[PDB]
């Protein structure tokens, strides 16, 4: 959610095309949705 | 992912023509001039109903096979030192355009022009034709059907199946997507794949692929007996109520307090049943077709070459001196290992093993004797007609019908686990 | 993280068709409740 | 009541997103009544 | 180590006096030049446009045309060295993966 | 591309380009020595 506000803004990476950095929270109810650049902090650019 | 497109011709058992006639190519192009339709291989038969029996195609793999020899044929045209597409018939068959996507009835003059004198055992390589080589989806989505035929070509006995063993498959939500099939059948599940497959390109490392090695694996498990409701994999496995039955399909299924343990590791192989009642296998056959499109998407391991006939080995796209072993299992035989697996966990009583093994006794005894019987006819054809020889079917031996260490085979499934 | 809750009525030796029932319906664990956030977090900011 | 009264033995589960499973089956408490049936049954054979 | 390209574009923006001040971090080489620009997304699609590591567009020009050129016989070619347009292609690290890219890109 | 959801007027256009070449091509025709003179000088600087 706060991603989709934030879009043009702060950039968020999105392993896969299907899943948007706009794309619902709620679609993302389950663990095996939640995105590999969300899993590792680390892995999204802290300056991004 | 595969990157080098070659094929060989096929070679004549000793006979010194293609072992097809007019009709049988007639019989094949029922209504259609391309042969690239998978369809066009074969009817496709649900199970049970399926398995198409006729004057012309005893079994789907004999009109495959029919296929296979007429291809060789038409496609040497094009392949032949000229490369040209429409100039000369094949038995009466001329290339509509230069990409060969169709065929039609040789014209008045070229009629009466003799046909391409094709060469047996010829190994081609795709690249050499240059329209192929200008479309690489083209060329890709053809190679599907060349793979397919060179691999029934390289093996001398019974065809090898390519089982391969992911944890990284089992990683994501495409195992949801496969979760999509549950309560599906593998058959029905496979036919959709297939489609799938057919109508895109994937890729070599692709979800689908993964997904198509996992239903794959599960399913082998599964028909080994390897995989049970009391040795689940996740608690997922394709379950067969009835083994022996006419189209039993071990279907997607969970079994809790049974959970199953896999030693960590990636282990991809192929492996050849010796029975011959493949050819009303349509398992097997499906398995098969999966195979040949996963060869399509990726490029595996050159097999042995002592696992290859010496004339085949050394096959630049397929065969390399160091390559895994086909596993040679009678069906008989591994219905029975599926049943000792299971008497041997107690699930089952031993004189339920035992009907089930008679049963199989019984339906192979039957197969045998029709096989056979279908073997006379074909030998008294082919005295009747020298000019118009053809083969039904690849020819076949009742050694096919012993075991040849089906159970080494059973161990060796049994030790990849 | 669990994701359902299942129960089975033979005992283990038996081997049986697996079928239809009705917790595999449902995937969520637990019955999904939603109620209004904002009356919540003033109570939260209100309590004495 | 909704089907399966020939049920061998009741097990209950659940299972994580990684796939770990907990499976709880209780211990079967006897009936008065089966006893008392097994044994008139017997009589009820003696006494037809 | 700083980004070549990204130095370039510097050079573009300071030339047509854009600001590059939001770019100026970008432009150290951090690892990879084509790692670096796969994170960049910001600046105008024309100004600098890459698709993953593949980026289409043209290369500081081999010569320059002054006033004088009549484009005379004893005048030398420049063989389009010259225009400051003449052709923009795409840079990527694998000629594989750029070929799977090209599979139905426009040849 | 744009890089706002709320962008801001954009002058560097091809469109605009040649909008701009057409004007200056005219504005010369009408600096011509020979078509200059019919024009009065008022009436020159207005059309520039």
């Given at each position: 959610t706060l991603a989709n506000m934030m879009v043009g803004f702060e950039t968020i990476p999105m392993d896969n095309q299907i899943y948007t950095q706009s794309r619902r929270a709620s679609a993302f109810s389950t663990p095996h949705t939640w995105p590999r650049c969300f899993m590792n902090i680390q892995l999204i650019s802290p300056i991004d | 992912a595969r990157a080098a497109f070659l094929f060989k011709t096929v070679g004549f058992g000793g006979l010194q023509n293609v072992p097809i006639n007019d009709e049988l190519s007639s019989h094949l192009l029922r209504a259609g001039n391309s042969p690239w339709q998978l369809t066009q291989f074969l009817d496709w038969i649900s199970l049970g109903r399926g398995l198409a029996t006729s004057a012309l195609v005893p079994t789907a793999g004999s009109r495959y096979?029919?296929?296979?020899?007429?291809?060789?044929?038409?496609?040497?045209?094009?392949?032949?030192?000229?490369?040209?597409?429409?100039?000369?018939?094949?038995?009466?068959?001329?290339?509509?355009?230069?990409?060969?996507?169709?065929?039609?009835?040789?014209?008045?003059?070229?009629?009466?022009?003799?046909?391409?004198?094709?060469?047996?055992?010829?190994?081609?390589?795709?690249?050499?034709?240059?329209?192929?080589?200008?479309?690489?989806?083209?060329?890709?989505?053809?190679?599907?059907?060349?793979?397919?035929?060179?691999?029934?070509?390289?093996?001398?006995?019974?065809?090898?199946?390519?089982?391969?063993?992911?944890?990284?498959?089992?990683?994501?939500?495409?195992?949801?997507?496969?979760?999509?099939?549950?309560?599906?059948?593998?058959?029905?599940?496979?036919?959709?794949?297939?489609?799938?497959?057919?109508?895109?390109?994937?890729?070599?490392?692709?979800?689908?692929?993964?997904?198509?090695?996992?239903?794959?694996?599960?399913?082998?498990?599964?028909?080994?007996?390897?995989?049970?409701?009391?040795?689940?994999?996740?608690?997922?496995?394709?379950?067969?109520?009835?083994?022996?039955?006419?189209?039993?399909?071990?279907?997607?299924?969970?079994?809790?307090?049974?959970?199953?343990?896999?030693?960590?590791?990636?282990?991809?192989?192929?492996?050849?049943?010796?029975?011959?009642?493949?050819?009303?296998?349509?398992?097997?056959?499906?398995?098969?077709?999966?195979?040949?499109?996963?060869?399509?998407?990726?490029?595996?391991?050159?097999?042995?070459?002592?696992?290859?006939?010496?004339?085949?080995?050394?096959?630049?796209?397929?065969?390399?001196?160091?390559?895994?072993?086909?596993?040679?299992?009678?069906?008989?035989?591994?219905?029975?290992?599926?049943?000792?697996?299971?008497?041997?966990?107690?699930?089952?009583?031993?004189?339920?093993?035992?009907?089930?093994?008679?049963?199989?006794?019984?339906?192979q005894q039957f197969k045998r004797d029709k096989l056979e019987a279908w073997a006379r006819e074909d030998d008294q054809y082919n005295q009747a007609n020298p000019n118009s020889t053809m083969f039904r079917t690849k020819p076949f031996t009742n050694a096919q019908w012993g075991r040849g260490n089906t159970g080494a085979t059973s161990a060796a499934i049994a030790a990849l686990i | 993280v669990p994701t359902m809750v299942g129960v089975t009525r033979q005992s283990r030796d038996t081997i049986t068709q697996p079928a239809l029932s009705l917790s595999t319906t449902n995937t969520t664990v637990g019955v999904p409740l939603a109620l209004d956030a904002r009356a919540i977090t003033v109570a939260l900011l209100s309590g004495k | 009541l909704s089907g399966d009264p020939r049920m061998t033995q009741l097990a209950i589960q659940y299972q994580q997103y990684n796939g770990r499973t907990f499976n709880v089956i209780p211990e079967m408490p006897g009936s008065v009544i089966a006893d008392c049936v097994q044994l008139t049954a017997e009589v009820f054979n003696h006494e037809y | 180590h700083v980004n070549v390209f990204v130095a370039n574009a510097l050079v573009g923006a300071f030339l047509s006096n854009q600001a590059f001040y939001d770019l100026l971090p970008l432009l150290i080489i951090n690892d990879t030049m084509i790692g670096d620009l796969l994170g960049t997304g910001a600046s105008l699609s024309q100004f600098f446009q890459s698709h993953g590591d593949v980026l289409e567009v043209a290369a500081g020009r081999k010569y320059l045309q002054m006033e004088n050129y009549s484009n005379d016989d004893d005048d030398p070619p420049l063989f389009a060295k010259d225009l400051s347009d003449y052709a923009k292609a795409f840079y990527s690290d694998t000629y594989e993966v750029l070929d799977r890219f090209f599979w139905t890109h426009d040849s | 591309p744009a890089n706002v959801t709320t962008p801001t007027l954009d002058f560097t256009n091809e469109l605009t380009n040649w909008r701009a070449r057409v004007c200056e091509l005219m504005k010369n025709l009408v600096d011509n020595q020979r078509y200059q003179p019919g024009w009065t000088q008022s009436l020159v600087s207005s059309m520039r």
């Open positions: - | 096979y029919q296929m296979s020899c007429l291809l060789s044929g038409t496609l040497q045209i094009p392949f032949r030192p000229n490369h040209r597409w429409g100039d000369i018939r094949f038995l009466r068959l001329v290339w509509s355009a230069p990409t060969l996507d169709g065929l039609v009835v040789a014209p008045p003059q070229v009629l009466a022009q003799p046909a391409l004198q094709a060469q047996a055992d010829r190994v081609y390589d795709c690249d050499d034709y240059p329209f192929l080589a200008r479309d690489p989806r083209f060329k890709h989505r053809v190679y599907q059907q060349l793979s397919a035929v060179t691999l029934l070509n390289l093996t001398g006995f019974g065809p090898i199946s390519y089982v391969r063993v992911d944890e990284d498959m089992w990683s994501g939500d495409v195992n949801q997507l496969l979760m999509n099939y549950f309560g599906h059948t593998f058959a029905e599940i496979a036919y959709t794949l297939c489609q799938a497959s057919a109508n895109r390109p994937w890729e070599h490392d692709g979800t689908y692929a993964r997904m198509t090695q996992i239903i794959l694996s599960l399913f082998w498990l599964s028909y080994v007996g390897v995989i049970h409701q009391q040795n689940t994999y996740r608690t997922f496995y394709f379950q067969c109520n009835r083994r022996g039955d006419a189209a039993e399909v071990w279907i997607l299924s969970c079994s809790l307090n049974h959970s199953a343990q896999i030693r960590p590791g990636n282990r991809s192989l192929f492996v050849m049943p010796t029975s011959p009642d493949w050819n009303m296998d349509v398992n097997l056959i499906l398995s098969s077709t999966l195979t040949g499109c996963l060869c399509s998407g990726s490029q595996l391991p050159l097999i042995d070459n002592n696992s290859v006939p010496a004339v085949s080995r050394n096959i630049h796209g397929w065969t390399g001196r160091a390559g895994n072993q086909l596993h040679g299992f009678q069906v008989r035989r591994m219905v029975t290992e599926f049943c000792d697996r299971l008497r041997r966990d107690g699930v089952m009583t031993q004189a339920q093993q035992n009907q089930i093994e008679a049963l199989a006794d019984q339906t | - | - | - | -």
